[PDB]
Amino acid sequence: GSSISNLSMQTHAARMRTFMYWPSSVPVQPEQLASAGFYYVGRNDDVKCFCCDGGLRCWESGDDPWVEHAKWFPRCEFLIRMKGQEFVDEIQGRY
Numbered sequence: 001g002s003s004i005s006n007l008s009m010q011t012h013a014a015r016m017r018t019f020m021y022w023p024s025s026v027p028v029q030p031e032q033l034a035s036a037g038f039y040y041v042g043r044n045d046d047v048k049c050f051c052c053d054g055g056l057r058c059w060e061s062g063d064d065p066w067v068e069h070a071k072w073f074p075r076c077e078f079l080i081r082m083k084g085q086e087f088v089d090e091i092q093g094r095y
């Protein structure tokens with residue numbers, strides 16, 4: 001079937017609902033994370049992408065979830081369709 005890792009998390013609205021217990025101390029906001037395909041897994045500040053199942057943690061002030069998505073998980077289909085291969089190639093070219 002579908003390549004999507006977590007079908008229940010395919011909508012922005014559903015991803016946002018997972019952030020009810022997101023610690024307010026974390027400098028990155030639920031809106032920025034959910035927009036970039038991430039949902040909260042309920043431990044610390046751990047998030048996973050609904051499409052590629054890539055996990056990120058230890059968010060710091062000034063982190064851009066889209067940039068982090070492209071840095072670590074460049075072949076994610078959701079990332080490529082939302083931001084484009086040109087964006088992914090640019091981020092990848094920094095490393």
Ligand SMILES: CCO[C@@H]1C[C@@H]2CN(C(=O)[C@@H](NC(=O)[C@H](C)NC)C3CCC(F)(F)CC3)[C@H](C(=O)N[C@@H]3CCOc4ccccc43)CN2C1
Nearest residue numbers: 041045046047048054055056057058059060063065068072
């Ligand atoms: C073999 C290839 O490994 C790459 C490295 C990259 C780092 N990363 C991360 O999440 C990194 N986070 C960041 O870069 C954050 C978003 N900005 C500072 C790590 C930065 C150093 C640290 F010590 F703080 C720990 C977080 C992710 C990560 O550590 N994810 C963990 C491990 C796998 O399981 C989960 C599950 C949920 C959430 C996170 C993770 C994915 N990693 C792949």
Ligand SMILES: [Zn+2]
Nearest residue numbers: 049051052076
């Ligand atoms: Zn992804």
